[PDB]
Amino acid sequence: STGSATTTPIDSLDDAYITPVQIGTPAQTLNLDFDTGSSDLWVFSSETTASEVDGQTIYTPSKSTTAKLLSGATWSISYGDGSSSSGDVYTDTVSVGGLTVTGQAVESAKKVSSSFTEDSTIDGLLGLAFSTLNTVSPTQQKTFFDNAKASLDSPVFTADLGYHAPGTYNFGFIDTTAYTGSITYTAVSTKQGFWEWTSTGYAVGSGTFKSTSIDGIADTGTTLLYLPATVVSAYWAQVSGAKSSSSVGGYVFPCSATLPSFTFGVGSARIVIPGDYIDFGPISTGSSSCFGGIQSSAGIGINIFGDVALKAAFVVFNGATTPTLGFASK
C-alpha cells in the first residue's frame, strides 16, 4: 500500500504545516502537524478542557463506531518549545492520504498548553519519530508509520515541504518526479529516538564550504534551523546590522536586508537554502527588525534541521531495518 497527502503552511511565514488526517468511522478529518521529532499522535477532542479549545476541530470518540478506549492508558508530553499536552487514549482507524491503519493509538487531549489553544489551525500532532519516544503509559504505543510499515510497498515516508506553498507527505514510495538529481543517503542513529544524522558541513552564501561534522535531527515539527553558535555567528556576520537580541530571543536583522543563502552538506552532496527561506518577518507588527530563520542551538542540547532546512530538500525517512535519511535537491 501507499499514501499521499498534501501538507499546507498554517500561515504566511511557514510557521508549521498541517496535513488532513481521517480518524474514526464515519471519518472525522482533523488537520495535524506531522512531527518527525516526536512519536505521539494526539488530538484536540470532546474531552479537552473547554476553555483550552479555541477554534480547533475536535475528535469525538463517542461518534466513532470503531473507537475503543484503551483502558488505563494515559499520555503526557512536553515539547522543546515549552508547550505540552496530556490525556487518555483510544484506538481507532486512522487514514492519511489513502493509507489506512486500524487500531492506531489516538491520544485524546484532556489538557493542552496555551500555545496550542492559541493556534486555531493545528488540531493535534502526528508523530513520526521512533516509537521508543511514545509517551503512552503503562503500555507504550506505536506511531502511525510504525503500524503501517509492514503493509507499505517500501518501508519509507518522504517529506517535501513547500516554501510559502503546499507540499507533500508520501508513505510507501519515492516519487522520482519530485526531486532533481540523485538522493544522497546518510546514516541515522536511533539512540535518542530521533532521525539523527551528521551533516558534513556548511557554507554561507557564495563562500567556501567548511567541512565539519554537525550532528542533528531531521525535525519537521520545528520551524527553524538550530545550529552551533559558531556556525550561526558566521552566517549572521554576513548580514549588515544583524545581531543576537537577548530580549527578542535570537538573531534579528534589518528587514531591509537581502539574506545570503545557507548550504549544508549531506555526504558529498549539498543542499542550498535560499536566503528568503531564512526571513521570518517583523518581530512584532510594523517593526523594521526581522526574526532570523537560523538560530543557535546552544542550550537546546541538540542541533535541529527544522523546516527552514528540510523545505529546501526532498527528504526520505527510510525505515528499513537499519534506518537511513535521504536528501535531494528539488
Swiss-Prot record:
Under Enzyme Commission nomenclature, its number is: 3.4.23.22
Catalytic activity field: Hydrolysis of proteins with specificity similar to that of pepsin A, prefers hydrophobic residues at P1 and P1', but does not cleave 14-Ala-|-Leu-15 in the B chain of insulin or Z-Glu-Tyr. Clots milk
Signal listed as a keyword: yes
The disulfide bonds in this chain are 255-290
Q: Where is the Peptidase A1 domain?
A: 17-328
One annotated GO biological process = proteolysis
Q: Where is the active site?
A: 35, 199
What GO annotations for molecular function exist for this entry? aspartic-type endopeptidase activity
- Report keywords, A-Z: Aspartyl protease, Disulfide bond, Hydrolase, Protease, Signal, Zymogen
Give the enzyme's main class according to its UniProt record, as a single word.
Answer: hydrolase
The similarity comment for this entry is: Belongs to the peptidase A1 family.
| Protein name, as recorded | Endothiapepsin
State the species of origin: Cryphonectria parasitica (Chestnut blight fungus)
- Its gene name is EAPA
Which residues of the parent chain are present? Answer: 90 to 419 of 419
